[PDB]
Assembly symmetry: C3
Homo-oligomer: 377 residues x 3
């Protein structure tokens, strides 16, 4: 009665249309001219497609909001989706719920989702989009601002298009310590961060079963690393195979190193950086060399006594400074075919050499046939 009129007003004001533009569904009602239809049973309203001829009458309206009329059919739920006219259901994935329409959203802790599959859709309590069909076409689809923020924050760049075509994740290939939250001030101990960055590229166990095992590690995808800040570390770094290290420029007699690696260990009787060479054990297994003075001989490589795990390693402008007293700067052992350009070791701290930030022995190399050191400083 008057209740119908006041309801038409509420609906009209919600969609921003005129009161006369709202129609109640009923078998046989004329749909012509109306902008919004109201289902008195479900108590849901839907924008109507423009172009319904006058004289066209309603035949049926399903609980999934599929409207059949004298001149054809239309999925009002799909139309609502296209128009971002949504209903946020009470509850959430945690509480569980049942969805019946395409324009219904269910709230998850990281944003809202609509269901793109078969309706009705039952979601048991304690669910997540993942456990109830996953996300993507025909399943859960992310909807709204909160959901967009979390997707962007936790993604890989696939939501960002780039030229000439494709998405951001297609062109992001270089790694940095900043991805691991390294401080990079040459004061904080960034060791664990640098080690994780390397492990994420090629994680080789310090102990391996046999020769086939150690060799497999030289057959992995190679990744380029960009060092743009100064990273203090306190334990010998072991570069695994398939690693390219880059820095904008190489140091040349610099008083204050600002970009690169700064080795500052408790035990100075060690090396800052070493390549990987595995030594044969009594039981027949192999352990990564961690001895500062060890270097493999050609004989070792043939005896099986040593197996190299240093290959596909390229260095461009790596600057390495060390605390005074450190024994060795770089241990280039077993690096056959490995290359270097602008590797710069040591800092020109000041006149007194005993306090300068450079090592006693700059570089020690063996078993490195075919390696090239271009413009080593």
């Amino acid at each position: 009665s008057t209740g119908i009129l006041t309801n038409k007003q509420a609906v009209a004001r919600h969609f921003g249309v005129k009161q006369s533009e709202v129609v109640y569904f009923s078998v046989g009602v004329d749909l012509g001219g109306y902008k919004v239809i109201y289902d008195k049973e479900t108590q849901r309203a839907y924008s109507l497609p423009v172009g319904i001829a006058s004289g066209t009458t309603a035949v049926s309206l399903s609980t999934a909001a599929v409207l059949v009329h004298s001149a054809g059919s239309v999925d009002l739920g799909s139309l609502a989706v296209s128009r971002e006219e949504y209903v946020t259901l009470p509850g959430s994935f945690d509480s569980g719920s049942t969805l019946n329409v395409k324009n219904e959203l269910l709230t998850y802790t990281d944003g809202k989702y609509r269901w793109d599959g078969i309706l009705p859709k039952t979601v048991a309590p304690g669910s997540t989009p993942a456990s109830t069909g996953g996300v993507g076409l025909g399943a859960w689809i992310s909807v709204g601002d909160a959901s967009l923020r979390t997707q962007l924050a936790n993604g890989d760049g696939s939501l960002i298009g780039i030229h000439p075509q494709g998405t951001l994740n297609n062109v992001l290939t270089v790694r940095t310590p900043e991805q691991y939250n390294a401080v990079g001030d040459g004061i904080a101990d960034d060791t664990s961060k640098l080690k994780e960055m390397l492990s994420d590229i090629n994680n080789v166990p310090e102990t391996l079963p046999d020769a086939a095992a150690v060799n497999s590690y030289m057959e992995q995808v190679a990744v380029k690393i960009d060092l743009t800040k100064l990273y203090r570390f306190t334990e010998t770094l072991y570069i695994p195979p398939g690693v390219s290290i880059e820095i904008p420029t190489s140091n040349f007699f610099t008083r204050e190193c600002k970009q690169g690696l700064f080795y500052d260990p408790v035990d100075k009787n060690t090396a800052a950086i070493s390549l990987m060479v595995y030594r044969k054990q009594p039981d027949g297994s192999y352990k990564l060399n961690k001895d500062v003075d060890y270097y493999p001989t050609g004989l070792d490589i043939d005896n099986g006594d040593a197996i190299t795990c240093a290959r596909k390693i390229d260095i461009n402008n790596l600057n390495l400074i060390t605390a005074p007293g450190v024994k060795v700067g770089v241990k280039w052992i077993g690096g056959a075919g490995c290359t270097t350009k602008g590797l710069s070791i040591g800092e020109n701290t000041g006149s007194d050499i005993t306090t300068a930030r450079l090592p006693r022995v700059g570089l020690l190399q063996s078993a490195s046939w075919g390696s090239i050191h271009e413009n080593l400083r």
Copy 2:
């Protein structure tokens, strides 16, 4: 207020806060009002999107704008936007599979074509020479792409991979040439040969190599310059005739180019070519640490 209808149905906007729904989101009109939108319209066909025209509004529109943009909506430090610093190309942009199983040929070709699209047939010397005066672009290959037809590198191309293979047992990053007709080359630079009618056709003959004389008398015209290769790894099916045809590449440079795979003991089934590299008419060409 989201007006009834859409761009498909057409509409008329009278207020600045009115939105018209399109297939990829909503838009408001930032130009003169009232604004009439004919049925069957699109934002691009009725003013374009930008200040004074259609302005994207709402989360749905934001998603599609970001998804189909160039990164101009993303600010970066110290200033400018993302598109200002994205300069490298990758097969992934073209949806290459990169597993060394699927045939990624058309994807790679499209990538090269998007950099410098050189027709296989040209009218004269001037025409072929023009393709050497185009913007150069750097390509990053980080996966393994199987391909089945000779790739012709056009001028103005830089190719890099993080590291160079070295007696590599299982190639993981680079190009794997696996054709039906093995009497071919995996990679070749472009050299145009004069035709009886005076026009020029791209060389696609595996045994052909231009001579200095050829270049002098115009029988051959090089379309190979401004090409730089850093760490390209090229493996091929057993029995492939030639890995790389470095023909007419004067001043072209290479560093860490690594050809062939140390597959196993039986060289007969090793993924390496019969002839690694064939070079002619490449004065001033430098190959640093070629493997």
Copy 3:
């Protein structure tokens, strides 16, 4: 009056008119999806799972609802629901 307001609030949230309840001391909250504060003239989605028999104790100007089974900051719930 109250019925027309219930209609207005219901259409805003996409619930049934009978699913809207007005806050008052002692009002039973069981089964309702939306609560309305007649003083501030603001409405809020109710947390799900409030049993029949659970009555309202108080509702602050900051939308903190205290009832028989405990309490809920309807403001926080609305944020999680992007109902602003």
